[PDB]
Design a protein around this ligand. Sequence first.
Ligand SMILES: COC1=C(OC)C(=O)C(C/C=C(\C)CC/C=C(\C)CC/C=C(\C)CC/C=C(/C)CC/C=C(/C)CC/C=C(\C)CC/C=C(\C)CC/C=C(\C)CC/C=C(/C)CCC=C(C)C)=C(C)C1=O
Ligand SMILES: NC(=O)C1=CN([C@@H]2O[C@H](COP(=O)(O)OP(=O)(O)OC[C@H]3O[C@@H](n4cnc5c(N)ncnc54)[C@H](OP(=O)(O)O)[C@@H]3O)[C@@H](O)[C@H]2O)C=CC1
Ligand code: SF4
Ligand code: SF4
Ligand code: SF4
Ligand code: SF4
Ligand code: SF4
Ligand SMILES: [K+]
Ligand SMILES: [Zn+2]
Lengths: 178, 103, 56, 96, 51, 155, 114, 102, 207, 145, 342, 145
Amino acid sequence: TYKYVNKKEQESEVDMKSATDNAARILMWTELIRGLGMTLSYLFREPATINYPFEKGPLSPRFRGEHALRRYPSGEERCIACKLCEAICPAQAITIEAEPRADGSRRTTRYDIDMTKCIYCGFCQEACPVDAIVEGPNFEFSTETHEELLYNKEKLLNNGDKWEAEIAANIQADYLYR
Amino acid sequence: EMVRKCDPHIGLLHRGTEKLIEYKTYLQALPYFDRLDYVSMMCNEQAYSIAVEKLLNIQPPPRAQWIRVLFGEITRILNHIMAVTTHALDIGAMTPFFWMFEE
Amino acid sequence: ASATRVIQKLRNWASGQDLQAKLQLRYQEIAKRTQPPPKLPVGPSHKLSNNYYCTR
Amino acid sequence: GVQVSPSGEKITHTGQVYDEKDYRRVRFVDRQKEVNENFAIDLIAQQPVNEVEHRIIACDGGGGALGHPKVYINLDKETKTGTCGYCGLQFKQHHH
Amino acid sequence: EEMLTNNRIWRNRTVDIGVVTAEDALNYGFSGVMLRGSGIQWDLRKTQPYD
Amino acid sequence: RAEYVVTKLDDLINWARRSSLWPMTFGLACCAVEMMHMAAPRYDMDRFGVVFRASPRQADVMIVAGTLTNKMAPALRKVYDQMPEPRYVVSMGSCANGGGYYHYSYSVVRGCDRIVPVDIYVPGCPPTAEALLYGILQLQRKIKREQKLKIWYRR
Amino acid sequence: TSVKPIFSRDLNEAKRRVRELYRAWYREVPNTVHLMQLDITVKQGRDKVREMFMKNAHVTDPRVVDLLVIKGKMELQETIKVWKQRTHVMRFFHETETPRPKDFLSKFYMGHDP
Amino acid sequence: KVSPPKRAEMKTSMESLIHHFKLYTEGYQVPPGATYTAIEAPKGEFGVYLVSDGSSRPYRCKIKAPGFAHLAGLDKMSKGHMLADVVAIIGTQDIVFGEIDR
Amino acid sequence: RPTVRPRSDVTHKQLSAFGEYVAEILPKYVQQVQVSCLDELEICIHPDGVIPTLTFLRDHTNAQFKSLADLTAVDVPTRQNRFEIVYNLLSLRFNSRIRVKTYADELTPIDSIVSVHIAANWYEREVWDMFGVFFFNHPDLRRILTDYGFEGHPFRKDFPLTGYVELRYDDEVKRVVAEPVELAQEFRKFDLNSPWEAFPAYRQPPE
Amino acid sequence: GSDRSRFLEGKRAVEDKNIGPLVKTIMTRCIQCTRCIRFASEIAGVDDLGTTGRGNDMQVGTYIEKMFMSELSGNVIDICPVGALTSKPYAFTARPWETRKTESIDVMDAVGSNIVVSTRTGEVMRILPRMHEDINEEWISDKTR
Amino acid sequence: LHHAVIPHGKGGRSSVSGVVATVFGATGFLGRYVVNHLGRMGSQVIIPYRCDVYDIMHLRLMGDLGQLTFLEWDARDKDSIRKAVQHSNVVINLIGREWETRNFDFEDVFVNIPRAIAQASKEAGVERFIHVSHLNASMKSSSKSLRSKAVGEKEVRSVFPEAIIIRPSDIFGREDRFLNHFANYRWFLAVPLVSLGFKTVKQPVYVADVSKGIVNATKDPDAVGKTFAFTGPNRYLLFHLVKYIFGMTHRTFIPYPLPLFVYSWIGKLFGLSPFEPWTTKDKVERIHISDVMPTDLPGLEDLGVQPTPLELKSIEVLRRHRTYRWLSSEIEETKPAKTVNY
Amino acid sequence: MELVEVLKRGVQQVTGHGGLRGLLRVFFRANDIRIGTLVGEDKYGNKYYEDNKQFFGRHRWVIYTTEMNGKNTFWDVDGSMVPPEWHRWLHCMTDDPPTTNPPTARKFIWTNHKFNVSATPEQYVPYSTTRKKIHEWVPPSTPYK
Ligand SMILES: COC1=C(OC)C(=O)C(C/C=C(\C)CC/C=C(\C)CC/C=C(\C)CC/C=C(/C)CC/C=C(/C)CC/C=C(\C)CC/C=C(\C)CC/C=C(\C)CC/C=C(/C)CCC=C(C)C)=C(C)C1=O
Ligand SMILES: NC(=O)C1=CN([C@@H]2O[C@H](COP(=O)(O)OP(=O)(O)OC[C@H]3O[C@@H](n4cnc5c(N)ncnc54)[C@H](OP(=O)(O)O)[C@@H]3O)[C@@H](O)[C@H]2O)C=CC1
Ligand code: SF4
Ligand code: SF4
Ligand code: SF4
Ligand code: SF4
Ligand code: SF4
Ligand SMILES: [K+]
Ligand SMILES: [Zn+2]
């Protein structure tokens, strides 16, 4: 179906009272006064502004923030050097050079994520088969140099150790959907 | 002040999206469509998804289709809010911009 | 929501419309941020029988 | 456990320390080289061996879906413990 | 709508501005909102529905 | 003591320049959509004293918000150069930081720091408006740390 | 053998179009240098135009010569307007980059490049 | 073989893990062919002309943006008008330049 | 089958009948007519008949395709004419879509259809800018998406993804200057092709 | 194959072997296809590999602790379709989608066998054989591998 | 060579050139061009600074992702100098002032700081030390700055015996203090030259030429203790040079003979300033000291740099100082200055 | 009436922050005068008040500590000074503060939170964890033979 937005059905003819009403609308600026009243009501409403650094904006457990490498409860790193997160990374922001460790486990030696190249899409964390790489809730990690956003494995493991008390709770609240 | 000719030079946001898409896989090329029209992200995603679904000869489940329509109309409200309020901002009024941007 | 009766009357008259019924600040009617865990259904082709891939 | 090079900088869990004559230490001059103190190899070395009864033991990471893919380890060799490939957990058959 | 639609300043700014005929819109291939603004009854959600 | 008076005067001028930050009405893409979401009533930059000005002559910080194309780069450099002297640059989003999703494109400058000196990098694609406000406050702290009069006095 | 021409039947009128384009560029160089505040002189710009024509001056296919004329007309049009800026018109000179030397000793001293 | 399985099924099943691995490394192979899919986007008819050569990467992806045609028609709409109504016409055309430039 | 699309053999038959109709109306130019299993009609014509074919489809009474949806090019650099120019046309009267294909090489231009559809102006500018396909009788044919001094046509298959030059600010000349491209990362190509064929319906006969 | 599993039981597991410093054996993922057995019997001709047991318990390898070290012994790593027999020096370093392949020839043997050098990020990662029916057929020797 | 210093990589801006260099006057005027050339060819550049990070912001570009390491330093802190130079093949010294402050005078600036930098470089075992002196800073000169640069040249030679010593002439370029100084003479009534600008011969040299010479010196197999004279290709009288400057500026030109005694008085009056002085007594003395003929010293020609003439690279400096009437004038609108030989 | 009740809530807010010094402290640090239920007091000194009568977004807030990790954060309040559990509660991913539902304790979790350390000596600098991948040669120390 369809409807008209500006077409009128027939006409209301010409009448003295309707003419006086239109004349008063033109001369007395009635729609302008109406708009004044609308923004006056908005003046007397309560603003939606939050006090920013003390009241943060609401979020969700699915939120994609700063990347982190997680660990098992034993303390062993979850990552098993399988590289499919960098295979699925649409920006080619991950570099996963790897070799067998001293105990023979399959681990990484270089895990770099270029945060200036990353598009923050979560494909790595939804591709990871062991929940090693995650995108935790940190978003206030702006830096004063370009180099500080070129993360390596030490930086990512430090972020994982820093945010594990929140990342684990979010994954607990979220994993039944994914 | 009268305009005799308009010549819009574009390409100052041309980033070779089609070439990058042909260099990446389908799931990798999906979030480019979020950035084509960055006011109707779910709508562009739906367009690309329906194209790939038609090529794959598969159909999404009915719950997925209803969610896609719901977020399609959500994108439509977002885009028409943006269009109307920024049009009014270019005309000269900014209070509808602030109200509908809270929404 | 925390406005006096005189200010509410002034807002309603100035706007021309009732504002307390549809005010644009969310107070308590929204969902709780902590939700019970879900149990998502499995779709078709989880049948364990008569489910060969060549037929679908 | 972090160690200190004779140059002075710390050694990561993949020992990659810059040499004495390597110029790439001005990046650490007036700044720091951060090394994750919790070495996963030591943390998994100090984990005890699980005594189980069956010849084949199934391993997750400790959760149904929060762990790793569910694998099976065969503990037929009495000389060595069976280590799961995803975690570093070791299992030994309780043959008594 | 109350702030803009009946406002005479907005009406003087928008009415009879950028008038596109239906035939010109079809020839220029606008196809989105300019068609139904010029009166062309076309919407893909009604004519070629997908979901 | 001249050091104390110079330090307090420098703190005063840093307070003025950090309480009155006028970014330019200049964006490029989805990151600029989040920039005007930072202008939105929720995270009121005007409450912070941050208010856009259209001309670069009345601007203080360029918020590079979007993909800096090769065709765009002379325009961005000219606009930055046309600012008056105490000027800052906040790169916003992966495109302005290091190219991002279009890093290997033939037409994209791999980071706006190849073109203009960047003061603060804000990561994200897009960074949230909260994150951009975080970068703005971090810039305010950065220019609070500046000691121009003290460096002049010991010069 | 037996191809379709685009503007020119043979090489003579292709060279005629080349001469017309070169005349237009030669006339436009002083106006470009005056309008866009170029560091170069009029002699340098005309020598650069001659250099570009010379580096394209080894092709004997009429279609390719016509396409080069068309692209040169497009470049001349965006130089007639100020669509090209100072940076765009100074990109022809390569004032920043150091040219790679043509001798085997230098190309052996630096890089594994032929 | 098109959608990734659930994570629990991926961690407990062999076929699910194989398909997770292959979808997140290579991706699904789209059978070769070309389509033009048009969707009523809010700014207009948003079209994708997809050409697939049979591999897991698209051979060609043309994006038809409505704003391209609208801005091509901007000069026709701006006849007998001034700077202010040219600004109005730019506003009334639903224009975003990411989709126009691609 | 809840995971497979429906077929619509009725609209497949309708498009086949209309393909026969156009192919017998214009035998001078039509080289091939095909209808896909996705119910899309493609008509592959000689490049000389672009203007008559597009005019017939613009205003014929039974074929009112007055709206031009898309005009693009596909670079297939293994055939003799390496560019396939594709027109996607929309019929609002009959609620249909048609696709018209023609071919070109680097030295064979195609007549522009600006006299038929005005959107073809910018679309053919984009085709020329991205593929180097010249268009006859085009008003102000020039670049539309590349940089002003850009050399080469980047949507071609032989053009590199990163291009040949990159821009940076140089303080000595106080300009934005162009340099030969030097990546600090070197985009890693991935060989994501399975050595087993996936679709036996498209198995080509051996050479 | 299908897209799902109907298997609701526990999977078997096989203890690993120590066949040599070149071939790492994770025999849990062997599919009992006897390709290595046929190769080592016919081409390499050592007759050291075989099947011990019956049924689902049938295992591939040597019954004793045997050091399977002959020339042409990485070709079991080549012909094993699963990752039961992998290359110990090429342990966990790269992936095939990562590796760029350059088709070259071999030195330190005057046969001049055709090889593929799999590099990644400017570093030689692996040497695979090529197919030349007149020189080396499908396989190469241990020294060149 | 250590493996990270091998010059592998074509060209610059993303390659390794093995020219790890600590540039000490990088925050100034010649230093920005030197840092630009080093970062263009692709090199580790350590910049010790004492001004504001905002004042070094313009140097934060022209280096590719950590190729430029900025660190604070103090001229009275040997530990700061040592930590600046301890990882460097090459140390380049560009420290200088055109005036004297309350903390640092000419003797300290041109003697004590270069000696401390050379001593720290020698103790850290750097391979090359390039030190920028001035041409005709020989000895017994009329100005204190030239004598101080001579004494510092001797001190750097004594501490670091194989230090390259580069003596340019009065360097011209954008944001210089030579062409911009003579163009800023327009703000007064006339141009006060000594002896009407005659008997004073100068051959100014371009900034890009000097910086290219410094980069070719830090890569050159020769120059292991040599002294270079970086001069322009043409020698001009001072009157003809100032007349050419005002011709390119298109302002006006009224010269005025002023004796050097009262001109030094006026220079001292201008130099009495807490900010950067517009001119000083040492500045006018160096203005009216003639350049020496570079006879036996090598220069840009055998360091591989073609000296660009001022008549070529002059419009990019003096176009700022024109009015709107003469802003769009080319090179040919101004006749070149007469070149003397002497 | 309503006005006197508003004035009563106003004087409650004025005389609800301890004393005049506490009122001025919260007014010149947090730029608001509000009374909320104390639910926080974390280990670093952040306060974490809440008030469910306010609308969504202003119903939870933190008064930051004046000192954290040696930095005088009286005026330089930072968004990264919140430890992760209070970060989750403050950003409203859950309705449960980490006083009734504490997070799971692990030995590798940081016992001390660090804020944004950019432009500080404790900032992050990237490396190349590579171990050089190439060993050149060592010429002998004995001259000739
Ligand atoms: C889809 O496509 C796209 C677009 O399309 C729709 C885009 O748009 C687009 C670009 C997008 C952007 C650039 C985003 C930017 C955001 C917006 C455009 C929206 C935000 C809103 C606005 C810009 C409107 C703002 C509206 C307002 C009402 C704010 C008010 C602003 C003002 C300028 C007016 C108020 C004045 C001031 C702030 C300053 C006033 C103060 C002074 C000048 C001080 C002067 C006083 C004195 C000198 C007094 C001194 C005298 C004394 C005596 C004092 C004594 C002193 C002592 C020390 C003693 C992109 C990229 C895009 O993709
Ligand atoms: N420019 C010319 O015309 C000529 C110059 N020279 C010489 O070449 C050298 C470089 O020239 P130029 O660029 O013009 O010089 P500048 O005037 O630009 O200053 C050079 C650098 O010296 C630093 N500096 C000065 N005094 C001190 C100090 N007390 N402690 C620490 N650093 C200090 C400055 O740092 P900051 O900004 O922090 O103060 C600046 O970065 C100088 O030695 C100069 O004498 C020789 C011939 C001609
Ligand atoms: S979020 Fe996306 S772009 Fe970022 S690292 Fe993960 S896969 Fe790559
Ligand atoms: S982070 Fe996960 S997906 Fe990436 S290599 Fe490690 S285990 Fe694989
Ligand atoms: S970083 Fe992401 S959100 Fe920002 S401009 Fe680029 S594509 Fe858009
Ligand atoms: S070749 Fe591999 S899969 Fe086949 S029997 Fe041998 S070890 Fe098992
Ligand atoms: S990659 Fe192949 S061999 Fe390895 S575990 Fe998977 S199915 Fe088995
Ligand atoms: K194998
Ligand atoms: Zn395990």
